[PDB]
């Protein structure tokens, strides 16, 4: 079937280049255009522009032309796009398309996107192998029901994925809330986890959150006491 | 050139979803569709205003005149959700415009307000010359929220970081936002606000510092 394959994920620092593959099969390379599009992280698809492998002929759209290259080698069916100067605002996931919705009349001479890749995520941070800070978010009862209380760890600046949070060394399940991780400009990431647990037990019971991140080898076991 | 689609639309299971996108003219350019599910690529669900590609069901149909342009879905399923894309290409520019795109939310389920849980920032983080608030959000259907932050009543929208949300293990879902500041910005405003807005409501929680 018809099929364009790119290439893996990528991580970049501020200020490099990148430079992302799409090959195709299933079709005849040089028989339509290839279009690439740009998709931020919740945000919404960006057209970057177009080129055609039998020609060469390139259509660069306002907000990349100039900063980003589009280039082709018909000898191995594949279309690459080169991003240069990156920037954070640069994190996204980029996808190519095969222009194969051919024009229907001379009036609209456009060649539309049929089929697409499967995108290459490229993400852009001054982000090294990091361990994480783990602070005490310590117990509130602000937002429980009554007669309990919220207590938690806040697991800070970590990558890459994953940290895995257990409590009391997992004697302590029930009423356990770990949140996914937020990935941020810095690209590093944090996550927060709260058990929901009895207020009266706050003096008698020692509540321990304990954070392992493998990447970096690095464990916490965080005591959250009622401050 | 621009095109126009609501950020949302919901319904509920075989009722018919109307998606719109609107453009100067659209009626004489021709339209084509794209569906994207959350760890899906853009996949064409309808090409040439109205027509329907192979193994699209017959549930998917388009139309365009006048200056809006408009997908249609019957009978819709849990499936369908997904984020739906109108493309035009803009001659006057030679560019291929796409619409901002609209969210299908599917109802299987009625609606969940969201509990808030404001956490300030911690001691030892302040000695670290750090400060971050933690604004943890649970409970909620449908999964789709949007979080500001203020502070001393006015908005704040440097360092703000908010996670999409994620299911639950009751099949609710959760998110969470954060705020990085420094400690003398925490410790200068009276008070920073995590304000979570849910299908037309907003629950707020307040912290301060000391």
């Known amino acids: 079937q018809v099929q364009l394959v790119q290439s893996g994920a990528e991580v970049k620092k501020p200020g490099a280049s990148v430079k992302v593959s799409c090959k195709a099969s299933?079709?005849?390379?040089?028989?339509?255009?290839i279009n690439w599009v740009r998709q931020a992280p919740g945000q919404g698809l960006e057209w970057m522009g177009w080129?055609?492998?039998?020609?060469?002929?390139?259509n660069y759209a306002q907000k990349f032309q100039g900063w980003v290259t589009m280039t082709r080698d018909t000898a191995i069916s594949t279309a690459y796009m080169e991003v240069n100067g990156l920037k954070s605002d640069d994190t996204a996931v980029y996808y190519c398309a095969r222009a194969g919705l051919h024009p229907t009349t001379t009036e609209y001479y456009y060649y539309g996107m049929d089929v697409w890749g499967q995108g290459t995520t490229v993400t852009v941070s001054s982000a090294s192998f990091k361990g994480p800070s783990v602070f005490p978010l310590a117990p509130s009862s602000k937002s429980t029901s009554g007669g309990t209380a919220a207590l938690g760890c806040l697991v800070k600046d970590y990558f890459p994925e994953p940290v895995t949070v257990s409590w009391n060394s997992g004697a302590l399940t029930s009423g356990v809330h770990t949140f996914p991780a937020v990935l941020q400009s810095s690209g590093l990431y944090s996550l927060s986890s709260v058990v929901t647990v009895p207020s009266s037990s706050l003096g008698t019971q020692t509540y321990i959150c304990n954070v392992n991140h493998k990447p970096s080898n690095t464990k916490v076991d965080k005591k959250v006491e009622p401050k | 050139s621009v095109l126009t689609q609501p950020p949302s639309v919901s319904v509920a299971p075989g009722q018919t979803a109307r998606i719109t996108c609107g453009g100067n003219?659209?009626?004489?350019?021709?339209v084509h569709w794209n569906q994207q599910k959350p760890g899906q690529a853009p996949v064409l669900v309808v090409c040439?205003?109205?027509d329907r590609p192979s193994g699209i069901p017959e549930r998917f149909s388009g139309s365009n005149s006048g200056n809006t342009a408009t997908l249609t879905i019957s009978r819709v399923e849990a499936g369908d959700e997904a984020d739906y894309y109108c493309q035009v290409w803009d001659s006057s520019s030679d560019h291929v415009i796409f619409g901002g795109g609209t969210k299908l939310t599917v109802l299987g389920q009625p609606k969940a307000n969201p509990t808030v849980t404001l956490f300030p920032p911690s001691s030892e983080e302040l000695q670290a010359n750090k400060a971050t608030l933690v604004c943890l959000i649970s409970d909620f259907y449908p999964g789709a929220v949007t979080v500001a932050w203020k502070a001393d009543s006015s908005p704040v929208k440097a360092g703000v970081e908010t996670t999409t949300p994620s299911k639950q293990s009751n099949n609710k879902y959760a998110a969470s936002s954060y705020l990085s500041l420094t400690p003398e910005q925490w410790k200068s405003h009276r008070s920073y606000s995590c304000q979570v807005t849910h299908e037309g409501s907003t629950v707020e929680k307040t912290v301060a510092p000391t």
């Open positions: 080129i055609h492998p039998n020609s060469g002929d390139t």
């Open positions: 040439y205003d109205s």
């Open positions: 299933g079709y005849t390379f040089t028989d339509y255009h």
């Open positions: 003219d659209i009626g004489r350019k021709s």
